[PDB]
Design a protein around this ligand. Structure first.
Ligand SMILES: *[C@@H]1O[C@H](CO)[C@@H](O[C@@H]2O[C@H](CO)[C@@H](O[C@@H]3O[C@H](CO[C@H]4O[C@H](CO)[C@@H](O)[C@H](O)[C@@H]4O)[C@@H](O)[C@H](O[C@H]4O[C@H](CO)[C@@H](O)[C@H](O)[C@@H]4O)[C@@H]3O)[C@H](O)[C@H]2NC(C)=O)[C@H](O)[C@H]1NC(C)=O
Ligand SMILES: *[C@@H]1O[C@H](CO)[C@@H](O[C@@H]2O[C@H](CO)[C@@H](O[C@@H]3O[C@H](CO[C@H]4O[C@H](CO)[C@@H](O)[C@H](O)[C@@H]4O)[C@@H](O)[C@H](O[C@H]4O[C@H](CO)[C@@H](O)[C@H](O)[C@@H]4O)[C@@H]3O)[C@H](O)[C@H]2NC(C)=O)[C@H](O)[C@H]1NC(C)=O
Ligand SMILES: *[C@@H]1O[C@H](CO)[C@@H](O[C@@H]2O[C@H](CO)[C@@H](O[C@@H]3O[C@H](CO)[C@@H](O)[C@H](O)[C@@H]3O)[C@H](O)[C@H]2NC(C)=O)[C@H](O)[C@H]1NC(C)=O
Ligand SMILES: *[C@@H]1O[C@H](CO)[C@@H](O[C@@H]2O[C@H](CO)[C@@H](O[C@@H]3O[C@H](CO)[C@@H](O)[C@H](O)[C@@H]3O)[C@H](O)[C@H]2NC(C)=O)[C@H](O)[C@H]1NC(C)=O
Ligand SMILES: *[C@@H]1O[C@H](CO)[C@@H](O[C@@H]2O[C@H](CO)[C@@H](O[C@@H]3O[C@H](CO)[C@@H](O)[C@H](O)[C@@H]3O)[C@H](O)[C@H]2NC(C)=O)[C@H](O)[C@H]1NC(C)=O
Ligand SMILES: *[C@@H]1O[C@H](CO)[C@@H](O[C@@H]2O[C@H](CO)[C@@H](O)[C@H](O)[C@H]2NC(C)=O)[C@H](O)[C@H]1NC(C)=O
Ligand SMILES: *[C@@H]1O[C@H](CO)[C@@H](O[C@@H]2O[C@H](CO)[C@@H](O)[C@H](O)[C@H]2NC(C)=O)[C@H](O)[C@H]1NC(C)=O
Ligand SMILES: *[C@@H]1O[C@H](CO)[C@@H](O[C@@H]2O[C@H](CO)[C@@H](O)[C@H](O)[C@H]2NC(C)=O)[C@H](O)[C@H]1NC(C)=O
Ligand SMILES: *[C@@H]1O[C@H](CO)[C@@H](O[C@@H]2O[C@H](CO)[C@@H](O)[C@H](O)[C@H]2NC(C)=O)[C@H](O)[C@H]1NC(C)=O
Ligand SMILES: *[C@@H]1O[C@H](CO)[C@@H](O[C@@H]2O[C@H](CO)[C@@H](O)[C@H](O)[C@H]2NC(C)=O)[C@H](O)[C@H]1NC(C)=O
Ligand SMILES: *[C@@H]1O[C@H](CO)[C@@H](O[C@@H]2O[C@H](CO)[C@@H](O)[C@H](O)[C@H]2NC(C)=O)[C@H](O)[C@H]1NC(C)=O
Ligand SMILES: *[C@@H]1O[C@H](CO)[C@@H](O[C@@H]2O[C@H](CO)[C@@H](O)[C@H](O)[C@H]2NC(C)=O)[C@H](O)[C@H]1NC(C)=O
Ligand SMILES: *[C@@H]1O[C@H](CO)[C@@H](O[C@@H]2O[C@H](CO)[C@@H](O)[C@H](O)[C@H]2NC(C)=O)[C@H](O)[C@H]1NC(C)=O
Ligand SMILES: *[C@@H]1O[C@H](CO)[C@@H](O[C@@H]2O[C@H](CO)[C@@H](O)[C@H](O)[C@H]2NC(C)=O)[C@H](O)[C@H]1NC(C)=O
Ligand SMILES: *[C@@H]1O[C@H](CO)[C@@H](O[C@@H]2O[C@H](CO)[C@@H](O)[C@H](O)[C@H]2NC(C)=O)[C@H](O)[C@H]1NC(C)=O
Ligand code: PAM
Ligand code: PAM
Ligand code: NAG
Ligand code: NAG
Ligand code: NAG
Ligand code: NAG
Ligand code: NAG
Ligand code: NAG
Lengths: 996, 55, 49, 54, 97, 110
């Protein structure tokens, strides 16, 4: 619907559609994106007009007089009046041809009248629209287009049709209209609106969402350019400072004040077109000094400046003898001109060692601009030259009177010894024996000394930076350095490093939502301490005394993301620097070396990474035949000796169905997790569409037009996906040289378990527990992808994508830099200047764009080196965790590695490492050796394999077990090494009770 | 093992609390958003990396 | 650890910067400029443990 | 034809023809299986690979 | 261990000390440069915004403030780029550790 | 430095670290600003097919017990004369199995 009811404060409800609402612009229209803009979206009153109804009113902008307002009506001034209706040819006006009657400043009446026949200029009477002044056609606007949907009129005279400013009249005081329509559905609206700052989302030049920056959380939303804030910490300001006192501190001096009055007599005439023209014969009179009225120097310690204006009229003969009428009335003003200070700011405690005003240009450092301001324009007529010397002997004061006023222990605007700012000034006990004032490394005043008693005062900012904690789109806490309320929070607590304000009731056992270091913030706003992770400990290679061996194992799955490749870009240096202009190319022929260097660097980087990636990826046909969910769910490829197993997947299939590729995928060889990661984190690489011209070009086509070519990357993603699929399918490949003979996944898992530790319980095996744990872990991971490791992986991929996008965005936006030239467009420069003058302008653009390209190349090379190191790490991970079991401790995740699977991810891959997690320990009495006695011959026996622990069972029989898993086995004589001596920690035994 | 992470308030660095400078910087708010987002994401990634290493 | 932390290398409390009891030091001035160094003593303690 | 200059899946031969570059194929990795009919590499030749590190 | 303790208050000890000293110095200089970038005028009458607004009319002062804004944004972008590069290098070092 | 230590001065147990294939030895030469390594690897050109068994279920009347290969990296198979042999999986180097190559366990697998 087109009718909405304004909320408190005059804000459009979030449920609106903005069917007849546009963004007002003086230039080009944004097609899509989010923008923080100052737009007339504060709806004071919304007048709904029904079908066949009549809306007739005369509105003055300084007069919020309103007729009907569905909703509350504000009492502020109205800036823009908007008509949101289909302004077709079936809209009738009660004033005849006139649709709008404008009363401008000075009583001038202007009309916007549409006729069915063309009206000649300065004469009186498809629809052709005109601006009429006194019944004569003053300006031709054009025929009414068939698609007008909104007309916005501003109090300053600007007209916006469908969002674009097509004409501006004089500032308007009052607007009379009388309209009626019948084809405007059910209701059409007239909105009185005021400007406000808001974040607007636009899609296809149409408004979709308007977020007003009216609250603290909305301020954060506008600062982040998004209406959905992720949980985290955001920098904010503690408070806002306004309406503070003023403090002035100056060195002691005599008090003598001089008033300098400048008299300006302006001469005005009426031109042939009725515009008031200010005469250059206007006179300036300075105070008399040394028999002269043309030069005046300040000779006291303090001074003030004032201007008095008189007006006279002429009749094109430069004889001023009349009084200026309403049209010819003007007021004399003084503008800055080329001076480093303004005339109106001289009475603002500015200090000089010498200040003289003159009417002659010689010896002058700068000049002011004397101008006459009329009701419509402002014209410069004279020049007032200034000769000044920097110092502190002479000060300009607001008025004649001690100038030293100091406000303490409160926010104030200070001017101390020439340094100005906003801050709080306090008295300190410190004794600094040198200097008058002190500044920081950034040049900000930190303290100053009173020259009467030597007391040192410190200066601090009124407002400081704070950190706001946002969880679920609301502010729950704030870390700040000042013990004052902020962001609507009242309760607070003290921390050794800061103050923490919160919604929590402070005069806590909760799960923190957002954490950094040892600090955590929960959902209810409470502050919690984050301690270091605790673990049971590492198993030690001890074989003496009571030792513990892990026994009961479950499965843990850990997710890791590693980047493998970048998104390579080719740049045409000539097209980037010169937008196809032949003259710019001729100029760039002298810089051709720089373009050659840039192109060579980019091409060599791309070639090296392609060579690196090419040698890493490979597939196997037989492995790819088994790499699918359908293959793992059937027994077609199983060796006939596995007739008991229903299929390849078995009990593990419930977890393998989300990792293996399936036919229910957008692309080939794609799995569920891969689709989730490529859709929840991330377009078209066809270039033939850019040159078609069938629609407005998108961002990629525009970048191509700028000479920026993103090289193909879909092929690399397909190669990575097939590579990971082949790696997954090779686990179950029974033999290599023949057909696709497959083994059950359970058999491969058993082989991996035997590699970890020799399994000695052939009959009583429980792989169902491990399979169920794996299935539940994979299910949780899949749910989380659509678990800190999953969060870290997601953050890493998101960061990679964002950085890749921003790198090209910055380079593209660097093309709108003028680089101290009249324009950033080469065609514009060559269409306005002669070639000798235009070449100098084009040279600056050339140098700036070459510098930007060099910066982009350097950043790209650094990124490429980092990704090369990351690719080396990924290759090591694939070789030592997926294609084999590594003997390196802790390399394939935290725990005892069993096997790893891999999937393709944006610009890289993700690994699922499966580890054994112990849940119990067995305690055994371990011995370092056996001291065997056979009468007079006593000899020692040590375990040959240093990784085995020797212990004794209840029946006094020696057993050996590995320390990774508790898999006891009977010791034999071949497991021992005979040595001469014995250790004190050995277990005594006889020849009869020896193993084997 | 780790760096010394820094948070920057872009508005306070560019404008020393001046409201008029903030009004002017409302037209560059995108650059400040990019800077803050980059710094915050870098700090969060290193904190996540360090957290999983120590025990 | 003490030898390395004293022969090669301050205060991370922000509440002292806004007190105004003396002239601000380098860290407080940087804070005033909108530059916040995040806590690192906790990380050093974690590494030591 | 044998491509002379390649990038990704695109290759250009000496005669100007455009060819597709597919991923490298291999027989596969030997698996630690000791059940059923298995294959063990027997006849070996020597391959030399060159790597540069700064 | 006694010799190492004496040296800390043996080429490996010297290399370790040099590495830690370099890390600390680089970390300090990175922030020092950014802080000192705030006294650049960037072709304006002053590097203080309060000074500019106390001497010029708002139409004249906005043009002066725009140059400072652009210069400080450029300095912040440079600082961010350097920080990200340092972070990547330290990430590789952390993997080694 | 890792490459020199683990590929030139020794043979690394890491799979695929010293080139694509089964690493035999590496040599090194000096290059501008660095070095180049020649990695020598074994490239197989054929495969031998054997019938491998995961263990031996030995029966001695009423006492039935299992035997597993002590070294997990060895494949157990049978020759034409019904004699058990062990071979590594990297190279086909069959050898006669002895009692010291087996571990005795209670149960048997299918
Ligand atoms: C690498 O991987 C290993 C696992 O392989 C991780 O180690 C585990 O880490 C967790 C978390 O610290 C440990 O779990 C904790 O155990 C404490 C001891 O439990 C007692 O009570 C149980 C009752 O069933 C007994 O079985 C046990 O023997 C103990 O007597 C618990 O107290 C902890 O409880 C947690 O939850 C409760 C309820 O909310 C809280 O009150 C507690 O404060 C606490 O938060 C917790 O269960 C686990 O024991 C470790 N396992 C092993 C084998 O070491 C490593 O942490 C991981 N490393 C890294 C860096 O990630
Ligand atoms: C790591 O190192 C290994 C070697 O250790 C590499 O693996 C070899 O890769 C090559 C290239 O893919 C493989 O060679 C190909 O074998 C195909 C199968 O051959 C059939 O026919 C021969 C006939 O003698 C039989 O012996 C064999 O058993 C098969 O029945 C061939 O068809 C391929 O022919 C190529 O050339 C012809 C002629 O131009 C073309 O028509 C083909 O399309 C094709 O291009 C080719 O010979 C080789 O088998 C692999 N060896 C092993 C042991 O796997 C890895 O590729 C390498 N990895 C990386 C990443 O570099
Ligand atoms: C690059 O190499 C890969 C891997 O060897 C090739 O994949 C193969 O693609 C073909 C064509 O799609 C597949 O054969 C066909 O599949 C369909 C399935 O519906 C079937 O209808 C046909 O009878 C036929 O078998 C083939 O299975 C597939 N191979 C593997 C191992 O997955 C790919 O085609 C190669 N690309 C090029 C351009 O040569
Ligand atoms: C994420 O992992 C958790 C790990 O606990 C999974 O929860 C577990 O889910 C299984 C299957 O539904 C539950 O088993 C069932 O237990 C009940 C109670 O004993 C029993 O009556 C049922 O017959 C069945 O055996 C198991 O209890 C449950 N565990 C817990 C602690 O809740 C969860 O399913 C995983 N999520 C996904 C999406 O896979
Ligand atoms: C740094 O390492 C050197 C390694 O030599 C240490 O010097 C050694 O110090 C020990 C303990 O004082 C000396 O032992 C003594 O030797 C004399 C001579 O035989 C004997 O009379 C004493 O009863 C005692 O056994 C040892 O000789 C000495 N070695 C040398 C080559 O001087 C030195 O102490 C270490 N520094 C620190 C601060 O720990
Ligand atoms: C707005 O225009 C309507 C016509 O569209 C005006 O109504 C007319 O008023 C005159 C003068 O009294 C009558 O003679 C006509 O009969 C009226 N027409 C209709 C259709 O009612 C109306 O007065 C105008 N409103 C203003 C100027 O406030
Ligand atoms: C256009 O606006 C002018 C200025 O407000 C109006 O002229 C005023 O008319 C009122 C009528 O009571 C007088 O009291 C004022 O003195 C007039 N001002 C001037 C400057 O002369 C004028 O009537 C308006 N024209 C319309 C509504 O058609
Ligand atoms: C202007 O006309 C348009 C159509 O040209 C109106 O929009 C349509 O409104 C009807 C009735 O609700 C919908 O069924 C159509 O889908 C709308 N068309 C669109 C959205 O393209 C619009 O309401 C009219 N505006 C006014 C103010 O009367
Ligand atoms: C500025 O001052 C000059 C000089 O007095 C004025 O020009 C004189 O005007 C009078 C009166 O009309 C003439 O009689 C003289 O002949 C003029 N002198 C010259 C040299 O032209 C001028 O009118 C003043 N301008 C004002 C008051 O706007
Ligand atoms: C600097 O110190 C002098 C001396 O204390 C201050 O002058 C005093 O002002 C108070 C308040 O008006 C009077 O009661 C004292 O009698 C003054 N003492 C004198 C004149 O010796 C002076 O105000 C201080 N300056 C500033 C800027 O705070
Ligand atoms: C290892 O622990 C066992 C128990 O698990 C200890 O054996 C017990 O020792 C206590 C204390 O002397 C006796 O009261 C019990 O009778 C013992 N139990 C058995 C079954 O012998 C044993 O002493 C511990 N061993 C070591 C080396 O500390
Ligand atoms: C490892 O898990 C097994 C299986 O749950 C545990 O053995 C059972 O433990 C429960 C709880 O005490 C007893 O009720 C059962 O009688 C046990 N079953 C058997 C067959 O012994 C075992 O205790 C766990 N291991 C350790 C070292 O705690
Ligand atoms: C194994 O037997 C030897 C030999 O009897 C024991 O060594 C004796 O230890 C006692 C103290 O426990 C000494 O007083 C004897 O002199 C030792 N005898 C010799 C010949 O050295 C040894 O303690 C026994 N070990 C264990 C673990 O019980
Ligand atoms: C392993 O392959 C061998 C052949 O190399 C298979 O043995 C043959 O099996 C076929 C099909 O039953 C028989 O017709 C032949 O007589 C067998 N040959 C011999 C020499 O026995 C054997 O079946 C395969 N083993 C497995 C487990 O699949
Ligand atoms: C490994 O190579 C050997 C040596 O060439 C092969 O043995 C010969 O194979 C050829 C070709 O079939 C026969 O003509 C010869 O009689 C074979 N010689 C011997 C001594 O057996 C052998 O076949 C190859 N191994 C495999 C598994 O193919
Ligand atoms: C007055 C200053 C107090 C400083 C307190 C610091 C607390 C929080 C800062 C967290 C910033 C770390 C970056 C991650 C930000 C995020 O999660 O979005
Ligand atoms: C030549 C006789 C002495 C000169 C007198 C000058 C008059 C006023 C002194 C102004 C300077 C005050 C400096 C403050 C010194 C301090 O307290 O540390
Ligand atoms: C415009 O309409 C009037 C009134 O009906 C008519 O006299 C005139 O001819 C029309 N003009 C055109 C160009 O149709
Ligand atoms: C406007 O036109 C009318 C009618 O001809 C005329 O009397 C009047 O003088 C005109 N006004 C102006 C300001 O030219
Ligand atoms: C300014 O100072 C006066 C006293 O001189 C005080 O009443 C007033 O509140 C102050 N204004 C502020 C702090 O804004
Ligand atoms: C200067 O002008 C002021 C008013 O701004 C007036 O009070 C004063 O007397 C004038 N001084 C002269 C004319 O010398
Ligand atoms: C500063 O002086 C005040 C007033 O005498 C005193 O109360 C305070 O304790 C002093 N502070 C210090 C740090 O000496
Ligand atoms: C906070 O809790 C106290 C008691 O601890 C209670 O008196 C007070 O009303 C609470 N404040 C709230 C709910 O705002």
């Amino acid at each position: 619907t087109n009718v909405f009811a304004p909320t408190v404060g005059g804000y459009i409800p979030d449920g609106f559609s903005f069917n007849n609402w546009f963004l007002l612009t003086n230039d080009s229209t944004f097609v899509s994106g989010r923008f923080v803009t100052n737009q007339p979206l504060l709806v004071n009153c919304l007048w709904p007009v029904p079908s066949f109804g009549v809306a007739a009113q005369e509105f003055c902008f300084e007069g919020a007089q309103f007729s009907q307002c569905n909703g509350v009506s504000l009492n502020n001034t109205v800036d823009v009046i908007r008509f949101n209706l289909n302004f077709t040819a079936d809209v009738q006006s009660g004033m005849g041809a006139t649709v709008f009657s404008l009363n401008t400043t000075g009583g001038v009446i202007l009309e916007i009248s549409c006729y069915n026949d063309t009206v000649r200029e300065s004469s009186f009477y498809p629809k052709y629209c005109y601006v009429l002044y006194n019944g004569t056609a003053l300006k031709y606007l054009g025929t009414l287009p068939p698609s007008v949907k909104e007309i916005a009129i501003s109090k300053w005279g600007h007209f916006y049709i469908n969002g674009y400013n097509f004409f501006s009249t004089f500032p308007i005081d009052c607007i009379s209209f009388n309209l009626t329509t019948s084809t405007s559905g059910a209701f059409w609206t007239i909105a009185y609106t005021s400007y406000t700052e808001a974040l607007v989302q636009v899609e296809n030049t149409a408004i979709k969402k308007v977020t007003y920056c009216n609250s603290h959380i909305n301020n954060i939303k506008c600062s982040q350019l998004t209406a959905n804030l992720q949980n985290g910490f955001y920098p904010v300001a503690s408070s806002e400072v306004g309406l503070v006192n003023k403090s002035v501190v100056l060195l002691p001096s005599f008090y003598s004040h001089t008033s300098v009055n400048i008299t300006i007599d302006l001469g005005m005439k009426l031109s042939g077109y009725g515009q008031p023209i200010a005469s250059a014969l206007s006179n300036i009179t300075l105070p008399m000094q040394d028999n002269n009225t043309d030069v005046y120097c300040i000779r006291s310690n303090q001074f003030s400046v004032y201007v008095h204006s008189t007006c006279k009229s002429s009749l094109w003969d430069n004889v001023f003898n009349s009084d200026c009428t309403d049209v010819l009335h003007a007021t004399a003003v003084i503008k800055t001109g080329t001076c480093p200070f303004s005339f109106d700011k001289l009475n603002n405690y500015l200090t000089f060692n010498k200040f003289c005003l003159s009417l002659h240009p010689v010896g002058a450092n700068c000049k002011f601009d004397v101008a006459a301001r009329t009701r419509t324009n402002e014209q410069v007529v004279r020049s007032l030259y200034v000769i000044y010397e920097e110092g502190d002997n002479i000060a300009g004061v607001p008025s004649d009177n001690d100038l030293s006023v100091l406000h303490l222990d409160s926010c104030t605007d200070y001017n101390i010894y020439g340094k100005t700012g906003i801050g709080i000034i306090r008295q300190t006990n410190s004794t600094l024996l040198s200097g008058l004032y002190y500044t920081s490394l950034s040049g900000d005043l930190l303290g100053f000394k009173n020259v009467t008693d030597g007391v040192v005062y410190s200066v601090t900012p009124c407002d400081v930076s704070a950190q706001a904690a946002v969880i679920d789109g609301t502010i729950v806490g704030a870390m700040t350095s000042i013990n004052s309320e902020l962001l609507g929070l009242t309760h607070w607590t003290t921390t050794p490093n800061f103050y923490y304000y919160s919604i929590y009731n402070y005069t806590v056992d909760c799960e923190p939502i957002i954490t950094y270091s040892n600090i955590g913030v929960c959902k209810n706003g409470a502050l919690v301490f984050i301690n270091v992770t605790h673990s049971d400990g590492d198993v030690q290679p001890i074989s003496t005394g009571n030792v513990t061996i892990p026994t009961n194992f479950t499965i843990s799955v850990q997710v890791e993301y590693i980047q493998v490749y970048t998104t390579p870009v080719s740049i045409d240096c000539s097209r980037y620097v010169c937008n196809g202009n032949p003259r710019c190319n001729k100029l760039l022929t002298q810089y051709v070396s720089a373009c050659q260097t840039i192109e060579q660097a980019l091409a060599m980087g791309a070639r090296l990474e392609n060579m690196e990636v090419d040698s890493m990826l490979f597939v196997s046909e037989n492995a790819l035949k088994l790499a699918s969910v359908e293959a793992f769910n059937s027994t077609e490829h199983l060796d006939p000796i596995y007739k008991e197993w229903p299929n390849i997947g078995g009990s593990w299939l419930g977890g393998l169905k989300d990792i293996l590729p399936s036919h229910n995928s957008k692309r080939k060889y794609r799995s569920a997790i891969e689709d989730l990661l490529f859709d929840k984190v991330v377009v078209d690489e066809d270039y033939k569409r850019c040159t078609g011209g069938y629609d407005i070009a998108d961002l990629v086509c525009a970048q191509y037009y700028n000479g920026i070519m993103v090289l193909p990357g879909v092929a690399n993603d397909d190669k990575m996906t097939m590579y990971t699929a082949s790696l997954a399918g090779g686990i179950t490949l029974g033999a290599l040289g023949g057909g696709a003979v497959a083994i059950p996944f359970a058999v491969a898992v058993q082989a991996r378990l035997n590699y970890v530790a020799l399994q000695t319980d052939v009959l009583n095996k429980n792989q169902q527990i491990l399979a169920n744990a794996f299935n539940q872990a994979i299910g949780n991971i899949t749910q989380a992808f659509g678990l800190a490791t999953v969060a870290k992986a997601l953050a890493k991929v998101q960061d990679v994508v964002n950085t890749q996008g921003q790198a090209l965005s910055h380079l593209t936006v660097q093309l709108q830099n003028n680089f101290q030239a009249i324009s950033s467009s080469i065609s514009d420069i060559y269409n306005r200047l002669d070639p000798p003058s235009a070449d100098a302008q084009v040279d600056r653009l050339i140098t700036g764009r070459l510098t930007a390209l060099n910066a982009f190349v350097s950043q790209t090379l650094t990124r490429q080196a980092e990704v090369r190191a990351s690719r080396q790490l990924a290759k090591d991970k694939v070789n030592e965790c997926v294609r084999s079991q590594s003997q390196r401790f802790g390399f394939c995740g935290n725990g005892t590695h069993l096997f790893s699977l891999a999937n393709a991810a944006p610009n890289g891959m993700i690994f699922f490492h499966t580890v054994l997690l112990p849940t119990a320990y067995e305690t055994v009495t371990a011995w370092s050796g056996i001291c065997a006695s056979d009468g007079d011959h006593t000899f020692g026996l040590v375990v040959k394999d240093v990784q085995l622990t020797l212990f004794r069972n209840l029946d006094d029989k020696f057993y050996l077990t590995p320390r990774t898993m508790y898999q006891p086995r009977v010791a034999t004589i071949s497991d021992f090494v005979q040595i001469e001596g014995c250790d004190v920690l050995f277990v005594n035994a006889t020849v009869i009770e020896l193993p084997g």
